[PDB]
Amino acid sequence: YCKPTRLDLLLDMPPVSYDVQLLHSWNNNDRSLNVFVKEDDKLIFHRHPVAQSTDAIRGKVGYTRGLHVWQITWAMRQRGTHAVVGVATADAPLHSVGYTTLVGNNHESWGWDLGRNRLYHDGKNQPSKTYPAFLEPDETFIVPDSFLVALDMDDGTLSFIVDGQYMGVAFRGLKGKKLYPVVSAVWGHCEIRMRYLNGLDPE
Amino acid sequence: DINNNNNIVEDVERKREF
């Protein structure tokens, strides 16, 4: 549960400008059509209040190498029954009927369910895993409104940092892919912000 | 409903996938 040195270095760097944030923000050309990027606030998408629907959207950049960190802000009261945060390849589906853990439900996505404290990957075929891993079985862990996602494409891992605490590696095995930030949501009018902070090339 | 959604608004993504 100790931050890697490379991550400590990145987290120390001043964060990138809004102009650069916009290069990595939510892609309005790579979404469920039941969400949209807000015109006046392009770091944020809005989900239309569609019943029995789960909807996702990918960030503009798919990372293949280096360490990358971004910030998610997702207000507790706008999470509903299935608030999932992670990464996906370009082939991951961005919608399902019903309310589900869309991100992590297939071989193309890896998600942390913020309400369940559970990780999903190929979730129709594999069991979910408790995260953070230190939680005893019935134990509650409240994810705050904002937290960080760390994708290390060189090591091939996804981890999370919550209120400055490294929560451990969530997923492994990601080397050689091209992975995009993604969230799946079920709450009507939820607005979810993603802010890219920095990246560090390999070496 | 339980997720602040309703049946009145169109499921555009579902109709796009039809």
Numbering used by the authors:
A (entry chain A): 31 to 233
B (entry chain C): 184 to 201
What does the paper say about this structure?
The structure of hSPSB1 in complex with VASA was refined to 2.05 Å resolution and contained two copies of the protein complex in the asymmetric unit. Overall, hSPSB1 residues 30–233 and VASA residues 184–201 were well defined. The two hSPSB1 molecules superimpose with a main-chain r.m.s.d. of 0.38 Å, with deviations observed in only the N-terminus and the long loop connecting β10–β11 (both distant from the peptide binding site). The VASA peptide is bound to GUSTAVUS and hSPSB1 in the same extended manner, with the central loop B of the protein dissecting the peptide into N- and C-terminal interaction sites. Between these sites, the central VASA residues Ile191, Val192, and Glu193 make little or no contact with the protein. The C-terminal peptide residues were poorly defined in the density, with only Asp194 and Glu196 forming significant interactions with hSPSB1 Asn64 and Leu63, respectively. The VASA contact residues in hSPSB1 and GUSTAVUS are conserved across both sites, highlighting the importance of this interface, and both complexes formed with similar affinity (Kd  ∼ 40 nM). Comparable hSPSB1 structures in complex with VASA and hPar-4 reveal identical positions of the Asp and Glu carboxyl, but the shorter Asp side chain affords an additional intramolecular main-chain hydrogen bond. This further stabilizes the bound conformation of the peptide and provides a rationale for the more favorable Asp interaction. The most significant difference in the hSPSB2/VASA structure is the complete lack of electron density for the C-terminal residues of the peptide: only residues Asp184-Asn190 are defined, compared to Asp184-Phe201 in the equivalent hSPSB1 structure.
The SPRY domain- and SOCS box-containing proteins, SPSB1 to SPSB4 (also known as SSB-1 to -4), contain a protein interaction domain known as the SPRY domain, which was first identified as a sequence repeat in the dual-specificity kinase splA and ryanodine receptors, together with a C-terminal SOCS box motif. The presence of the SOCS box motif suggests that the SPSB proteins may function as part of an E3 ubiquitin ligase, with the SPRY domain determining the substrate(s) for ubiquitination, and this has been confirmed recently for SPSB2 (Z.K., R.S.L., R.S.N., and S.E.N., personal communication). All three hSPSB proteins share the same conserved SPRY domain fold with two short N-terminal helices packed against a bent β-sandwich, comprising two 7-stranded β-sheets. The structures show remarkable conservation of the SPRY domain fold and absolute sequence conservation for positions in contact with the (E/D)(L/I)NNN motif.
